[PDB]
Amino acid sequence: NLDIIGKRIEKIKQEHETSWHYDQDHPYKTWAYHGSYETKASSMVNGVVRLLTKPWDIIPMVTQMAMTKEKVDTRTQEPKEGTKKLMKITAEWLWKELGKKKTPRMCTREEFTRKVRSNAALGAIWKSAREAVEDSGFWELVDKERNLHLEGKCETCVYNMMAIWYMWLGARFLEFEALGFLNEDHWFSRENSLSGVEGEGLHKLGYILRDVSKKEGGAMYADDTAGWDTRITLEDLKNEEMVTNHMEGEHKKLAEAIFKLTYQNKVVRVQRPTTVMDIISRRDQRGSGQVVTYGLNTFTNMEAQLIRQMEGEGVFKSIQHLTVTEEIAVKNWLVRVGRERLSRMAISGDDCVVKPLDDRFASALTALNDMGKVRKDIQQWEPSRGWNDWTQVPFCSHHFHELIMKDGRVLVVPCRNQDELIGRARISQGAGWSLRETACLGKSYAQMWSLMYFHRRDLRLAANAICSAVPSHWVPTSRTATHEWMTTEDMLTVWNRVWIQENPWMEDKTPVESWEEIPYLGKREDQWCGSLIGLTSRATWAKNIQTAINQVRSLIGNEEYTDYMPSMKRFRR
Ligand SMILES: O=S1(=O)CCCN1Cc1cccc(F)c1
Ligand SMILES: [Zn+2]
Numbered sequence: 001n002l003d004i005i006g007k008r009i010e011k012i013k014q015e016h017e018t019s020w021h022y023d024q025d026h027p028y029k030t031w032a033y034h035g036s037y038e039t040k041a042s043s044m045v046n047g048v049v050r051l052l053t054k055p056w057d058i059i060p061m062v063t064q065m066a067m068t069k070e071k072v073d074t075r076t077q078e079p080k081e082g083t084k085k086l087m088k089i090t091a092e093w094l095w096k097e098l099g100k101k102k103t104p105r106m107c108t109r110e111e112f113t114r115k116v117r118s119n120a121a122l123g124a125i126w127k128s129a130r131e132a133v134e135d136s137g138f139w140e141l142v143d144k145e146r147n148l149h150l151e152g153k154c155e156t157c158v159y160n161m162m163a164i165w166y167m168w169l170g171a172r173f174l175e176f177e178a179l180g181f182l183n184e185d186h187w188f189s190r191e192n193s194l195s196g197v198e199g200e201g202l203h204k205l206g207y208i209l210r211d212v213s214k215k216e217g218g219a220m221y222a223d224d225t226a227g228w229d230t231r232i233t234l235e236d237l238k239n240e241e242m243v244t245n246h247m248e249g250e251h252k253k254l255a256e257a258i259f260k261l262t263y264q265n266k267v268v269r270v271q272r273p274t275t276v277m278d279i280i281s282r283r284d285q286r287g288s289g290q291v292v293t294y295g296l297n298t299f300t301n302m303e304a305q306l307i308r309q310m311e312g313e314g315v316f317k318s319i320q321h322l323t324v325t326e327e328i329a330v331k332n333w334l335v336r337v338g339r340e341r342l343s344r345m346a347i348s349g350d351d352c353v354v355k356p357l358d359d360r361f362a363s364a365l366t367a368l369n370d371m372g373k374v375r376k377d378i379q380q381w382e383p384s385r386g387w388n389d390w391t392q393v394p395f396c397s398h399h400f401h402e403l404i405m406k407d408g409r410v411l412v413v414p415c416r417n418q419d420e421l422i423g424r425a426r427i428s429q430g431a432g433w434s435l436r437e438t439a440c441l442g443k444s445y446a447q448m449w450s451l452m453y454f455h456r457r458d459l460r461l462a463a464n465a466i467c468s469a470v471p472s473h474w475v476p477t478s479r480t481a482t483h484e485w486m487t488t489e490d491m492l493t494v495w496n497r498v499w500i501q502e503n504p505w506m507e508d509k510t511p512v513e514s515w516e517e518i519p520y521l522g523k524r525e526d527q528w529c530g531s532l533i534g535l536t537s538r539a540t541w542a543k544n545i546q547t548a549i550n551q552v553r554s555l556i557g558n559e560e561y562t563d564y565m566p567s568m569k570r571f572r573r
């Protein structure tokens, strides 16, 4: 206990010696409380996108998105011995498969520096990250902590609750040095993991689900976990740490210390209004950089789902205890069919789709419930509802349509309710946005829509409008998947590269010559997915779109603009 977290606690106590109140009115039950001390970010509207989406100003599902816990303080029972055994064997086998064609390695100050100078979310708390990285005293702070970790101790690796947990860049660097390889070297690529989709892109996910649908077997299951990060057990963290069994030298020691000192024994600071700072600690649950969180969530989800598959296939009889012959059967299933069973899944962190061998999977719930991965919105022992059609399966907040081009070629396209897409593009985060920076964020949403959602009538029109309203040469930006729309290249050229040239599911590579060759959903199916086609508000907006474009051009001023509206049939004279 205080053995490992004491130093971090001691150091914070001193820095606030004149306010160390041990509140007895502390609300924590499952989080150990240590002490307290004295201390003291809304969604803004993007005006460029809102001025060009007027019909949505009266749609509450869009307008409410711009307005405006008790699951972090929960406990997870210890799994049974049969469950623990199944997890240990599966985890051991899975790190070996992921490691067959990859080599664990340390990520570098050099690589970390480049990532900070290209504005990548690292959950940090010198002003900006940029100025800390170009000064050397910081790296001496990193070195002192680095040397403390090699010694098996920790001083400065403390979480700041805000449920996301920021850290001092020094802690982030040390996490990235030891475990960044999982993301930097694509351990969860589909080629390397079989179930993963890391680096895939939203224009690949529907093709991937259609490929899973082609396997013989049962329904497609897509069960969501209730609060996945809160259900990560200490047994889960131990099975994840076994990646260090594949490491050597410094790296092995540096990685072992991240897992022991910061993952399996955390220290957190949380603001309470009664405003004081609450210094609490817990060994279990997920708390780590969002990028390491993604890869280890993928790993543990792949593990859990292969065990749910083993349960449905009768590989083991009970989670209470695994007979010595069951152990051999589980390991033999893995060697014989493990890679085929991974191929029956698409897993993106806590998000999965599984096409099992048959529907016995639907009621194979004992291992899943006992690992703590309790399903959301369903009674603990009620059998899973499966999907009969890959086009109805939810995955990564989307569903996927099969869309046939006038020339017979087949697109599998990503889709979601259009109110969600318009409502998100109308929101910015943070202060100090110039009109130019607001315009360039609108342009990023517009180009994403032209590439991913070209099949939705309202979005291809609004995307053309925004791109006409923002100066042609201004570069799309974001402050916070592969992002092919982040470019000043012509969007028809990018569309051809993504959907035809580089698309491994498209055998005929004939380029498309104009946007009019590129199809929409059926008119009814566009409505079903939230389109306003057919409403008087929408018809007036489309007819008068040049007036809206000219309003935004007048605000931005006398700049070079291109009219993209004649790329659409109806504006082609
Ligand atoms: O589905 S409907 O509402 C019934 C008539 C066809 N639709 C209207 C419409 C207007 C403008 C463009 C368009 F593709 C379709
Ligand atoms: Zn540390």
Ligand SMILES: [Zn+2]
Pocket: 399, 401, 415, 416, 529
């Ligand atoms: Zn749809």
